[PDB]
Design a protein around this motif. Structure first.
Motif, mmCIF file in Angstrom:
data_model
loop_
_atom_site.group_PDB
_atom_site.id
_atom_site.type_symbol
_atom_site.label_atom_id
_atom_site.label_comp_id
_atom_site.label_asym_id
_atom_site.label_seq_id
_atom_site.Cartn_x
_atom_site.Cartn_y
_atom_site.Cartn_z
ATOM 1 N N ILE A 114 3.746 -2.598 -11.487
ATOM 2 C CA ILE A 114 3.043 -2.169 -12.692
ATOM 3 C C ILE A 114 4.045 -1.659 -13.724
ATOM 4 N N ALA A 115 5.069 -0.930 -13.272
ATOM 5 C CA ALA A 115 6.122 -0.458 -14.163
ATOM 6 C C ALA A 115 7.108 -1.556 -14.547
ATOM 7 N N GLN A 233 -8.303 15.317 -6.169
ATOM 8 C CA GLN A 233 -9.411 16.188 -6.539
ATOM 9 C C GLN A 233 -9.764 16.025 -8.010
ATOM 10 N N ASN A 234 -8.786 15.662 -8.838
ATOM 11 C CA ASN A 234 -9.005 15.492 -10.264
ATOM 12 C C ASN A 234 -10.200 14.570 -10.508
ATOM 13 N N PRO A 235 -11.310 15.079 -11.053
ATOM 14 C CA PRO A 235 -12.439 14.191 -11.363
ATOM 15 C C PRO A 235 -12.131 13.190 -12.458
ATOM 16 N N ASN A 236 -11.075 13.412 -13.239
ATOM 17 C CA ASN A 236 -10.662 12.493 -14.286
ATOM 18 C C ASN A 236 -9.523 11.594 -13.835
ATOM 19 N N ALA A 237 -9.299 11.478 -12.533
ATOM 20 C CA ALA A 237 -8.256 10.613 -12.017
ATOM 21 C C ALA A 237 -8.833 9.261 -11.622
ATOM 22 N N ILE A 238 -8.033 8.222 -11.827
ATOM 23 C CA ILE A 238 -8.287 6.906 -11.259
ATOM 24 C C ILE A 238 -7.444 6.804 -10.000
ATOM 25 N N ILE A 239 -8.099 6.677 -8.853
ATOM 26 C CA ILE A 239 -7.435 6.751 -7.559
ATOM 27 C C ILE A 239 -7.250 5.331 -7.046
ATOM 28 N N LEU A 240 -5.999 4.894 -6.932
ATOM 29 C CA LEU A 240 -5.669 3.591 -6.376
ATOM 30 C C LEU A 240 -5.471 3.770 -4.879
ATOM 31 N N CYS A 241 -6.478 3.347 -4.112
ATOM 32 C CA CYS A 241 -6.466 3.381 -2.657
ATOM 33 C C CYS A 241 -5.849 2.066 -2.209
ATOM 34 N N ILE A 242 -4.606 2.140 -1.754
ATOM 35 C CA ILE A 242 -3.770 0.978 -1.513
ATOM 36 C C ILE A 242 -3.668 0.802 -0.007
ATOM 37 N N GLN A 243 -4.164 -0.322 0.490
ATOM 38 C CA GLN A 243 -4.257 -0.560 1.918
ATOM 39 C C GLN A 243 -3.436 -1.779 2.302
ATOM 40 N N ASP A 244 -2.820 -1.682 3.476
ATOM 41 C CA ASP A 244 -1.991 -2.745 4.024
ATOM 42 C C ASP A 244 -2.910 -3.866 4.487
ATOM 43 N N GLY A 245 -2.815 -5.021 3.830
ATOM 44 C CA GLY A 245 -3.699 -6.131 4.135
ATOM 45 C C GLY A 245 -3.468 -6.762 5.492
ATOM 46 N N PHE A 270 -9.718 -0.259 -5.218
ATOM 47 C CA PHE A 270 -9.121 -0.760 -3.988
ATOM 48 C C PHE A 270 -7.974 -1.706 -4.317
ATOM 49 N N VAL A 271 -6.851 -1.534 -3.624
ATOM 50 C CA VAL A 271 -5.680 -2.387 -3.779
ATOM 51 C C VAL A 271 -5.339 -2.957 -2.411
ATOM 52 N N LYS A 341 -11.371 -13.419 -6.916
ATOM 53 C CA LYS A 341 -11.575 -13.918 -8.265
ATOM 54 C C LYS A 341 -10.316 -13.708 -9.102
ATOM 55 N N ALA A 342 -10.167 -14.556 -10.124
ATOM 56 C CA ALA A 342 -8.917 -14.597 -10.877
ATOM 57 C C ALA A 342 -8.585 -13.253 -11.507
ATOM 58 N N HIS A 343 -9.597 -12.505 -11.941
ATOM 59 C CA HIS A 343 -9.379 -11.185 -12.520
ATOM 60 C C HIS A 343 -9.142 -10.111 -11.465
ATOM 61 N N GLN A 344 -9.236 -10.454 -10.182
ATOM 62 C CA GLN A 344 -9.016 -9.514 -9.091
ATOM 63 C C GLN A 344 -7.639 -9.645 -8.456
ATOM 64 N N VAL A 345 -6.736 -10.426 -9.044
ATOM 65 C CA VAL A 345 -5.457 -10.718 -8.415
ATOM 66 C C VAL A 345 -4.321 -10.430 -9.386
ATOM 67 N N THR A 346 -3.147 -10.161 -8.813
ATOM 68 C CA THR A 346 -1.906 -9.995 -9.561
ATOM 69 C C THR A 346 -1.812 -8.633 -10.240
ATOM 70 N N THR A 347 -0.595 -8.278 -10.661
ATOM 71 C CA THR A 347 -0.352 -6.972 -11.264
ATOM 72 C C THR A 347 -1.078 -6.823 -12.596
ATOM 73 N N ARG A 348 -1.119 -7.896 -13.392
ATOM 74 C CA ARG A 348 -1.628 -7.799 -14.757
ATOM 75 C C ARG A 348 -3.054 -7.257 -14.786
ATOM 76 N N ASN A 349 -3.926 -7.781 -13.923
ATOM 77 C CA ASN A 349 -5.338 -7.420 -13.991
ATOM 78 C C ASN A 349 -5.559 -5.971 -13.577
ATOM 79 N N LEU A 350 -4.917 -5.550 -12.487
ATOM 80 C CA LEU A 350 -5.008 -4.163 -12.047
ATOM 81 C C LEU A 350 -4.503 -3.224 -13.131
ATOM 82 N N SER A 351 -3.337 -3.550 -13.696
ATOM 83 C CA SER A 351 -2.743 -2.700 -14.717
ATOM 84 C C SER A 351 -3.659 -2.588 -15.923
#
Lengths: 766, 51, 51, 52
Positions: A114-115, A233-245, A270-271, A341-351
């Motif tokens: 993402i960076a 805990q931050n209610p204003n956080a977006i939490i990326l739950c990243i799991q080993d596929g 979910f990542v 789905k195409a919008h569910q893959v790759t760094t660009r869409n998540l970012s």
């Protein structure tokens, strides 16, 4: 001679000045006069100046606004909130993005992709994946990174600068960990900029574990959770739950933590990592459609995304990883059979998804929180005005300083207390301590004789033994307690309206310690022995004035004991007849028996006032038999107790009648007249004891005021210095002031500046 | 307790009389006089509390 | 002239008898009280100078 | 609120805060900011004890 320590301190202080003033005047005051003004030029102006040199390299004016991207300004906003209060209670106010996942699942690679650079160190796969980093993501014309605490810019397209960047992070990473635990919360802040990079702020948190092994502490599992839960805990956080596929979704470890902050995944995403390694899933719809739609998890996310994090190489370049990510999904079955789905893959869409949510929430959220923290200053100002009249002069440390000065001032004033008061205290205490020996052992047995030489001989034997053994020790005890009690009084007196409760806590802690660090010089016991003897040694009443002083002290000392004996006898014998018929104070049987026994002993003494204290045992039997004849029950113990009290009363009252006769007894001694019973020698004893009390009190006072009180001042200064260095004592003493509330009112001014400046930047941009 | 203003008002009031007074003289004399007053009041309360 | 603390003794004697007083009412009362004493003493000194 | 000491103190505080942001004080701040740059940068040279 009144006091000597202060002279020594002044003398050697002046000597130190005479020898070293050409250095001490420079070091102590010259520079220090400007010390308050020097620090802003020395440190603050230094941080600005080097930042301005980097702004000069940028070639953009510092004063003119739009110098930096709105998100780059928002990183400072989050940093100032973190600095003001690192607890989640303050983190909750503004948007964040949390990067959390299973240990070594590639979540760090997700963040780095993402960076758009390999910005974080990956030296090892065990300890380097269980520690936090934070990175802001900003738009730019060139991929460049800059730390909060460094002027160096890092080129993100070259291996050398990326390696140095990872090295700085690593230097912070491998130290911000509890020993053995290898996991501790801490903040590392990097700003990463470049084309294609979104307006976000991502926090990589320690990898999540479910079990502990021999190479890790058992607590490591819990500590991670504590960190992991903190930013979730931050209610204003977006939490990326990243799991080993490569492992079952049902076996995810991070999920069981995310459900503790978002039980249904409302604000979570979910990542899926290692998509090109977990062939068993990416090649089968029956797993992927559930994992990516939100059916295989309890979590109903903001979105679901699949990424390539590297082909098992922890050090693989991010650029190659992204190229391979774009190639893989096209190569894989997943795109053809619509399991992802195409919008569910790759760094660009998540970012882009997380960027839109986070940044749109940030534009609205910063507009709210500037007024929130400004309103918090207004809320802090209502409480502070209501608690105390508007004032900020005091401080927690200043409470110690003021109580220290109060204590030292009272100790000095103690040292300059009118000495005469010190002797008065010592004299009264000494008399109260010694009167028991004076009368019970010395006077009482001595004055029962029919020879003045035997009175004086008994007195002098008892006095030699007493002045050598007990009396000096008692005097030293009296002096010790006098000094410590007066010290306590100065430390504690509730001086009307001039008393301050807040300082009291210190006054108690020092008062205790200062006493224990003082000891009275034991040699006094021997000196007193000599001195006391000398005061007694004067047995000669040369004139009327000392005769009267002597009779006064004898009357006082004997009247006290006579009154005590009379009270005991009144209780023992019972009320008079007048009471018995006017107030119906009827006597008890014991009182009647005691009355009759007293009448027996008193007729004996009235007939013969010369009778000594000790009766014959057959006399005790005669007293019992005569008492038994009249009808009074009596035993030898009743007679001995009644006898003791009655004979002491007779003895003391006879002594006072002898006072009445001594007051006018002088001619008989010039006559040498043989029929003269009156011999006034007890007067000399009590004269001697009065003068000895005076001498002992005065000697003790002098030892106090020239030797011991200055030692006490030294010990108090030592105790106060030791308590001044003790931070815990300041924390747990002198805590009463309201300055703490005002400290928040003043400190939140940095948050107030960052937020308002960010909002005005939103207004210059739109 | 006599405050410093109470002590000063006593010091100058006596200096106006011509009596030469200082804060410690008054502090100790006040302690004695006030304790006399206080203990006599306490003995009157002793008598009161009986009933 | 009354010393800054001589104002405090004038305040104490007045405070004891039940008179609210402040240093400004002691300075105004004194300026008028000593303007009058001074001039009347001067006129009695006139009466004595006459002879 | 009229003839109230606490209200008078609040009124006294509001007038006092406006004088604290008076043009005299504002010009003092502006000139002082340049004066912080003026007769400054000598201090970093002064810390060195080698000459001493």
């Amino acid at each position: 001679a009144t006091d000597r320590g202060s002279e020594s301190d002044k003398h050697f202080r002046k000597v130190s000045d005479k020898e070293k003033i050409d250095q001490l005047q420079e070091e102590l005051l010259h520079t220090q006069l400007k010390y308050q003004r020097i620090l802003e030029r020395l440190e603050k102006e230094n941080k600005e100046l080097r930042k301005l040199v980097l702004q000069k390299d940028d070639k953009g004016i510092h004063h003119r606004k739009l110098k930096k991207s709105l998100i780059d300004m928002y990183s400072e906003v989050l940093d100032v909130l973190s600095d003001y209060d690192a607890s989640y209670n303050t983190q909750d106010h503004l948007p964040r993005v949390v990067v959390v996942g299973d240990q070594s699942a590639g979540k760090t690679s997700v963040l780095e992709m993402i960076a758009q650079a390999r910005i974080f160190p990956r030296g090892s796969g065990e300890m380097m994946t269980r520690s936090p980093v934070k990175v802001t993501l900003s738009e730019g014309p060139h991929h460049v990174a800059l730390f909060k605490d460094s002027s160096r810019e890092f080129d993100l397209t070259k291996e050398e600068d990326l390696a140095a960047l990872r090295h700085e992070i690593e230097l912070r990473m491998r130290k911000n960990v509890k020993e053995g635990c290898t996991v501790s919360p801490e903040t590392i802040s990097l700003n990463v900029k470049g084309p294609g990079l979104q307006r976000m702020v991502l926090v990589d948190l320690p990898g999540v574990i479910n079990t502990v092994t021999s190479g890790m502490a058992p607590d490591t599992k819990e500590t991670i959770f504590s960190i992991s839960k903190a930013y979730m805990q931050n209610p204003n956080a977006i939490i990326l739950c990243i799991q080993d596929g490569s492992v079952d979704a049902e076996r995810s470890i991070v999920t069981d933590l995310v459900s503790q902050m978002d039980p249904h995944g409302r604000r979570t995403i979910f990542v899926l990592t290692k998509v090109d390694l977990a062939e068993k899933n990416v090649a089968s719809p029956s797993r992927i459609q559930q994992i990516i739609e939100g059916k295989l998890f309890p979590m109903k996310a903001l979105g679901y995304f699949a990424v390539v994090t590297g082909k098992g190489n922890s050090s693989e370049s991010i650029e190659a990883i992204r190229e391979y990510e774009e190639e893989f999904f096209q190569n894989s079955k997943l795109l053809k059979t619509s399991m992802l789905k195409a919008h569910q893959v790759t760094t660009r869409n998540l970012s882009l998804a997380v960027s839109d949510c986070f940044w749109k929430m940030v534009r609205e959220s910063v507009e709210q929180q500037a007024d929130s923290f400004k309103a918090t200053r207004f809320n802090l100002e209502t409480e502070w005005k209501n608690n105390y009249p508007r004032l900020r002069e005091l401080d927690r440390n200043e409470l110690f300083e003021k109580a220290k000065n109060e204590i030292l001032d009272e100790v000095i004033s103690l040292s300059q207390v009118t000495p005469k008061h010190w002797e008065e205290i010592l004299q009264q205490s000494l008399w109260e301590r010694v009167s028991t020996h004076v009368i019970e052992n010395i006077y009482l047995p001595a004055a029962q004789t029919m020879n003045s030489g035997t009175f004086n001989t008994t007195v002098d034997i008892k006095l030699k033994q007493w002045t050598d053994k007990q009396l000096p020790n008692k005097a030293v005890e009296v002096a010790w307690e006098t000094l410590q009690e007066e010290f306590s009084r100065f430390m504690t007196e509730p001086k009307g309206k001039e008393h301050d409760d807040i300082f009291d806590k210190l006054k108690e802690a020092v008062k205790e310690e200062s006493i224990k660090r003082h000891k009275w010089n034991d040699f006094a016991e021997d000196s007193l022995r000599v001195i006391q003897h000398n005061a007694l040694e004067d047995r000669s009443i040369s004139d009327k004035q000392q005769w009267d002083a002597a009779i006064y002290f004898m009357e006082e000392a004997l009247q006290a004991r006579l009154k005590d004996t009379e009270n005991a006898i009144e209780n023992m014998v019972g009320p008079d007849w007048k009471k018995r018929w006017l107030y119906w104070k009827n006597r008890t049987q014991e009182q009647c028996v005691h009355n009759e026994t007293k009448n027996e002993l008193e007729k004996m003494l009235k007939c013969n006032e010369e009778h000594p204290a000790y009766l014959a045992s057959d006399e005790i039997t005669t007293v019992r038999k005569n008492l038994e004849s009249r009808g009074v029950e009596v035993d030898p113990s009743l007679i001995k107790d009644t006898w003791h009290q009655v004979y002491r009363r007779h003895f003391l009252k006879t002594a006072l009648n002898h006072c009445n006769l001594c007051r006018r007894g002088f001619y008989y001694y010039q006559r040498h007249f043989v029929d003269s019973e009156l011999e006034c020698n007890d007067v000399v004893l009590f004269w001697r004891i009065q003068r000895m009390l005076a001498i002992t009190a005065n000697t003790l006072r002098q030892q106090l005021t020239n030797t011991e009180v200055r030692r006490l001042e030294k010990n108090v200064k030592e105790v106060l210095e030791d308590f001044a260095e003790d931070g815990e004592k300041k924390i747990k003493l002198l805590t009463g002031k309201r300055v703490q509330l005002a400290e928040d009112l003043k400190k939140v001014r940095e948050i107030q500046e960052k937020l308002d400046a960010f909002i005005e930047a939103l207004h210059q941009e739109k």
